Amino acid sequence: ADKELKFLVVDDFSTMRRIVRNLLKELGFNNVEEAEDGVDALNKLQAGGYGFVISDWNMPNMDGLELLKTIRADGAMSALPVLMVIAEAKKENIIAAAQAGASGYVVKPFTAATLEEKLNKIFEKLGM
Amino acid sequence: DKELKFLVVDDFSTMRRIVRNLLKELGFNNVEEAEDGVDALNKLQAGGYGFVISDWNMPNMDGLELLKTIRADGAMSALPVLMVIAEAKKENIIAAAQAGASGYVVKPFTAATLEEKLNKIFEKLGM
Protein backbone atom coordinates (compact mmCIF):
# COMPACT_ATOMS: atom_id res chain seq x y z
CA ALA A 1 0.00 0.00 0.00
CA ASP A 2 0.84 3.73 -0.24
CA LYS A 3 2.95 4.46 2.91
CA GLU A 4 1.27 7.78 3.02
CA LEU A 5 -2.19 6.25 3.54
CA LYS A 6 -3.91 8.51 6.10
CA PHE A 7 -5.32 6.53 9.07
CA LEU A 8 -7.70 7.53 11.82
CA VAL A 9 -7.25 5.66 15.15
CA VAL A 10 -10.33 5.83 17.44
CA ASP A 11 -10.40 4.84 21.10
CA ASP A 12 -11.35 6.76 24.22
CA PHE A 13 -8.33 5.28 26.07
CA SER A 14 -5.32 7.48 25.19
CA THR A 15 -2.73 4.73 25.86
CA MET A 16 -4.24 2.28 23.32
CA ARG A 17 -4.45 5.03 20.64
CA ARG A 18 -0.71 5.65 21.22
CA ILE A 19 0.01 1.88 21.13
CA VAL A 20 -1.68 1.45 17.74
CA ARG A 21 0.08 4.56 16.41
CA ASN A 22 3.43 3.00 17.39
CA LEU A 23 2.50 -0.32 15.63
CA LEU A 24 1.53 1.48 12.32
CA LYS A 25 4.72 3.51 12.49
CA GLU A 26 6.78 0.31 12.86
CA LEU A 27 4.95 -0.96 9.74
CA GLY A 28 6.03 2.22 7.83
CA PHE A 29 2.79 4.22 8.21
CA ASN A 30 3.40 7.63 9.71
CA ASN A 31 0.33 9.57 8.66
CA VAL A 32 -1.98 8.89 11.61
CA GLU A 33 -4.49 11.12 13.46
CA GLU A 34 -6.49 10.31 16.64
CA ALA A 35 -10.07 10.74 17.76
CA GLU A 36 -11.62 9.83 21.11
CA ASP A 37 -15.15 8.60 20.30
CA GLY A 38 -17.33 8.18 17.15
CA VAL A 39 -18.46 11.88 17.26
CA ASP A 40 -14.91 13.25 17.28
CA ALA A 41 -14.18 10.69 14.62
CA LEU A 42 -16.98 11.87 12.32
CA ASN A 43 -16.05 15.56 12.80
CA LYS A 44 -12.47 14.72 11.77
CA LEU A 45 -13.50 12.53 8.79
CA GLN A 46 -15.40 15.46 7.29
CA ALA A 47 -12.12 17.44 6.74
CA GLY A 48 -11.20 14.74 4.28
CA GLY A 49 -8.38 12.69 2.94
CA TYR A 50 -8.59 9.66 5.23
CA GLY A 51 -7.94 6.19 3.74
CA PHE A 52 -8.47 3.88 6.78
CA VAL A 53 -10.31 3.79 10.08
CA ILE A 54 -9.21 1.68 13.05
CA SER A 55 -11.86 1.72 15.73
CA ASP A 56 -12.48 0.42 19.26
CA TRP A 57 -15.81 -1.26 19.93
CA ASN A 58 -16.64 0.52 23.17
CA MET A 59 -16.69 4.33 23.48
CA PRO A 60 -18.94 7.06 24.95
CA ASN A 61 -21.02 9.54 22.85
CA MET A 62 -20.91 7.24 19.79
CA ASP A 63 -19.56 3.66 20.06
CA GLY A 64 -17.65 1.52 17.50
CA LEU A 65 -20.65 -0.18 15.93
CA GLU A 66 -22.55 3.16 15.53
CA LEU A 67 -19.43 4.77 14.01
CA LEU A 68 -19.24 1.88 11.45
CA LYS A 69 -22.92 2.14 10.54
CA THR A 70 -22.73 5.88 9.97
CA ILE A 71 -19.80 5.53 7.63
CA ARG A 72 -21.43 2.64 5.76
CA ALA A 73 -24.52 4.77 5.20
CA ASP A 74 -22.69 7.92 3.99
CA GLY A 75 -22.51 8.37 0.18
CA ALA A 76 -19.13 10.05 0.20
CA MET A 77 -17.52 7.44 2.44
CA SER A 78 -19.59 4.30 2.27
CA ALA A 79 -16.65 2.17 1.05
CA LEU A 80 -14.01 3.43 3.59
CA PRO A 81 -11.96 0.53 5.08
CA VAL A 82 -12.87 0.01 8.78
CA LEU A 83 -11.00 -2.47 11.06
CA MET A 84 -12.90 -3.15 14.31
CA VAL A 85 -10.94 -3.69 17.51
CA ILE A 86 -12.74 -5.99 20.02
CA ALA A 87 -11.79 -7.30 23.54
CA GLU A 88 -12.56 -11.03 23.19
CA ALA A 89 -12.90 -13.43 20.21
CA LYS A 90 -16.66 -13.58 21.00
CA LYS A 91 -18.42 -15.19 18.05
CA GLU A 92 -21.56 -13.13 18.50
CA ASN A 93 -19.76 -9.69 18.65
CA ILE A 94 -17.75 -10.65 15.66
CA ILE A 95 -21.07 -11.52 13.93
CA ALA A 96 -22.51 -8.07 14.79
CA ALA A 97 -19.44 -6.41 13.16
CA ALA A 98 -19.67 -8.54 9.94
CA GLN A 99 -23.40 -7.79 9.71
CA ALA A 100 -22.56 -4.03 9.98
CA GLY A 101 -20.02 -4.13 7.13
CA ALA A 102 -16.67 -4.17 9.10
CA SER A 103 -13.77 -4.75 6.70
CA GLY A 104 -12.06 -6.97 9.30
CA TYR A 105 -11.71 -7.21 13.10
CA VAL A 106 -8.75 -7.74 15.48
CA VAL A 107 -8.64 -8.83 19.13
CA LYS A 108 -6.77 -6.59 21.60
CA PRO A 109 -4.13 -6.75 22.84
CA PHE A 110 -2.36 -7.51 19.47
CA THR A 111 1.21 -7.58 18.16
CA ALA A 112 2.63 -5.76 15.12
CA ALA A 113 2.66 -9.05 13.17
CA THR A 114 -1.13 -9.56 13.69
CA LEU A 115 -1.89 -5.95 12.75
CA GLU A 116 0.22 -6.32 9.56
CA GLU A 117 -1.63 -9.46 8.55
CA LYS A 118 -5.08 -8.02 9.16
CA LEU A 119 -4.14 -4.87 7.15
CA ASN A 120 -2.63 -6.91 4.32
CA LYS A 121 -5.87 -8.91 3.98
CA ILE A 122 -7.97 -5.68 3.60
CA PHE A 123 -5.43 -4.16 1.21
CA GLU A 124 -5.50 -7.20 -1.12
CA LYS A 125 -9.30 -7.25 -1.39
CA LEU A 126 -9.47 -3.55 -2.27
CA GLY A 127 -6.39 -3.53 -4.57
CA MET A 128 -4.70 -0.96 -2.31
CA ASP B 1 -17.10 12.89 -20.85
CA LYS B 2 -20.48 11.88 -22.40
CA GLU B 3 -18.05 9.69 -24.28
CA LEU B 4 -17.22 7.61 -21.13
CA LYS B 5 -17.84 4.01 -22.11
CA PHE B 6 -20.24 1.92 -20.04
CA LEU B 7 -20.54 -1.86 -19.76
CA VAL B 8 -24.12 -2.92 -18.79
CA VAL B 9 -24.22 -6.40 -17.17
CA ASP B 10 -27.30 -8.54 -16.72
CA ASP B 11 -28.44 -11.95 -17.99
CA PHE B 12 -31.92 -10.57 -18.97
CA SER B 13 -31.48 -8.87 -22.37
CA THR B 14 -34.70 -6.84 -21.92
CA MET B 15 -33.29 -5.22 -18.72
CA ARG B 16 -30.05 -4.43 -20.61
CA ARG B 17 -31.95 -2.63 -23.37
CA ILE B 18 -33.85 -0.59 -20.77
CA VAL B 19 -30.63 0.52 -19.00
CA ARG B 20 -29.04 1.30 -22.39
CA ASN B 21 -32.08 3.47 -23.28
CA LEU B 22 -31.96 5.35 -19.89
CA LEU B 23 -28.22 6.10 -20.53
CA LYS B 24 -28.93 7.42 -24.12
CA GLU B 25 -31.68 9.62 -22.59
CA LEU B 26 -29.02 11.07 -20.23
CA GLY B 27 -26.64 11.72 -23.21
CA PHE B 28 -24.39 8.68 -22.91
CA ASN B 29 -24.22 6.78 -26.20
CA ASN B 30 -21.08 4.67 -25.83
CA VAL B 31 -22.55 1.56 -24.17
CA GLU B 32 -21.72 -2.17 -24.40
CA GLU B 33 -23.49 -5.25 -23.05
CA ALA B 34 -22.36 -8.33 -21.11
CA GLU B 35 -24.49 -11.32 -20.08
CA ASP B 36 -22.76 -12.52 -16.89
CA GLY B 37 -19.73 -11.82 -14.78
CA VAL B 38 -17.64 -14.11 -16.97
CA ASP B 39 -18.55 -12.36 -20.17
CA ALA B 40 -18.02 -8.94 -18.50
CA LEU B 41 -14.45 -9.71 -17.32
CA ASN B 42 -13.77 -10.98 -20.80
CA LYS B 43 -14.59 -7.44 -22.05
CA LEU B 44 -13.03 -5.34 -19.21
CA GLN B 45 -9.81 -7.33 -19.77
CA ALA B 46 -9.70 -6.09 -23.41
CA GLY B 47 -9.73 -2.46 -22.08
CA GLY B 48 -11.07 1.03 -22.13
CA TYR B 49 -14.32 0.98 -20.17
CA GLY B 50 -14.99 3.89 -17.70
CA PHE B 51 -18.02 2.60 -15.78
CA VAL B 52 -19.74 -0.66 -14.92
CA ILE B 53 -23.48 -1.04 -14.17
CA SER B 54 -24.15 -4.59 -12.97
CA ASP B 55 -27.07 -6.74 -11.84
CA TRP B 56 -26.88 -8.62 -8.51
CA ASN B 57 -27.87 -12.07 -9.72
CA MET B 58 -26.40 -13.76 -12.75
CA PRO B 59 -25.22 -17.28 -13.51
CA ASN B 60 -21.53 -18.40 -13.48
CA MET B 61 -20.41 -15.20 -11.70
CA ASP B 62 -22.82 -12.86 -9.93
CA GLY B 63 -22.57 -9.10 -9.30
CA LEU B 64 -20.80 -9.30 -5.91
CA GLU B 65 -18.25 -11.88 -7.33
CA LEU B 66 -17.66 -9.55 -10.31
CA LEU B 67 -17.11 -6.48 -8.03
CA LYS B 68 -14.76 -8.46 -5.87
CA THR B 69 -12.78 -9.63 -8.89
CA ILE B 70 -12.61 -6.12 -10.28
CA ARG B 71 -11.55 -4.55 -6.99
CA ALA B 72 -8.75 -7.04 -6.41
CA ASP B 73 -7.25 -6.46 -9.91
CA GLY B 74 -4.40 -3.94 -10.28
CA ALA B 75 -5.61 -2.20 -13.42
CA MET B 76 -9.40 -2.41 -13.13
CA SER B 77 -9.28 -1.71 -9.37
CA ALA B 78 -10.47 1.97 -9.52
CA LEU B 79 -13.30 1.51 -12.04
CA PRO B 80 -16.64 2.92 -10.84
CA VAL B 81 -19.18 0.10 -10.26
CA LEU B 82 -22.93 0.76 -9.71
CA MET B 83 -24.84 -2.28 -8.41
CA VAL B 84 -28.50 -2.92 -9.38
CA ILE B 85 -30.47 -4.72 -6.54
CA ALA B 86 -34.11 -5.98 -6.64
CA GLU B 87 -35.35 -4.50 -3.35
CA ALA B 88 -33.73 -2.32 -0.67
CA LYS B 89 -32.39 -5.24 1.44
CA LYS B 90 -30.15 -3.65 4.02
CA GLU B 91 -28.09 -6.82 3.87
CA ASN B 92 -27.33 -6.25 0.15
CA ILE B 93 -26.72 -2.50 0.54
CA ILE B 94 -24.08 -3.20 3.25
CA ALA B 95 -22.34 -6.12 1.49
CA ALA B 96 -22.03 -3.95 -1.64
CA ALA B 97 -20.35 -1.13 0.43
CA GLN B 98 -17.95 -3.41 2.36
CA ALA B 99 -16.93 -4.83 -1.04
CA GLY B 100 -16.13 -1.41 -2.53
CA ALA B 101 -19.20 -0.71 -4.69
CA SER B 102 -19.42 2.91 -5.92
CA GLY B 103 -23.21 3.10 -5.43
CA TYR B 104 -26.38 1.05 -5.74
CA VAL B 105 -29.82 1.62 -7.33
CA VAL B 106 -33.09 -0.34 -6.88
CA LYS B 107 -34.75 -1.65 -9.99
CA PRO B 108 -36.92 -0.67 -11.56
CA PHE B 109 -35.58 2.90 -11.65
CA THR B 110 -35.99 6.06 -13.72
CA ALA B 111 -33.73 8.19 -15.93
CA ALA B 112 -34.11 10.67 -13.12
CA THR B 113 -32.97 8.29 -10.35
CA LEU B 114 -30.13 7.07 -12.54
CA GLU B 115 -28.87 10.55 -13.23
CA GLU B 116 -28.75 11.47 -9.54
CA LYS B 117 -26.92 8.23 -8.83
CA LEU B 118 -24.39 9.01 -11.60
CA ASN B 119 -23.76 12.63 -10.47
CA LYS B 120 -22.96 11.68 -6.88
CA ILE B 121 -20.51 9.07 -8.12
CA PHE B 122 -18.90 11.52 -10.62
CA GLU B 123 -18.70 14.23 -7.91
CA LYS B 124 -17.14 11.92 -5.29
CA LEU B 125 -14.59 10.70 -7.93
CA GLY B 126 -14.00 14.21 -9.22
CA MET B 127 -14.95 12.92 -12.71
Curated annotation (Swiss-Prot), chain B:
In terms of InterPro entries, this protein maps to: CheY-like_superfamily (IPR011006), Sig_transdc_resp-reg_receiver (IPR001789), ST_Response_Regulator (IPR052048)
Per the record, its GO cellular-component terms are: cytoplasm
Keywords (alphabetical) are:
Acetylation, Chemotaxis, Cytoplasm, Flagellar rotation, Magnesium, Metal-binding, Phosphoprotein, Two-component regulatory system
Q: How is it modified after translation?
A: Phosphorylated by CheA or acetylated by acetyl-CoA synthetase, depending on which acetate metabolism pathway is available.
Query: What is the role of this chain?
Result: Involved in the transmission of sensory signals from the chemoreceptors to the flagellar motors. In its active (phosphorylated or acetylated) form, CheY exhibits enhanced binding to a switch component, FliM, at the flagellar motor which induces a change from counterclockwise to clockwise flagellar rotation.
* Annotated residues for binding of Mg(2+): D10, D11, D55, N57
Q: Which SUPFAM superfamilies match?
A: CheY-like
Q: Which PANTHER family match?
A: TWO-COMPONENT RESPONSE REGULATOR, TWO-COMPONENT RESPONSE REGULATOR ARR22
Q: Which gene encodes it?
A: cheY
One of its GO biological process terms is: chemotaxis
Task: According to the UniProt record, list the residues that bear N6-acetyllysine.
Answer: K90, K107
Task: Quote the protein name from its UniProt record.
Answer: Chemotaxis protein CheY
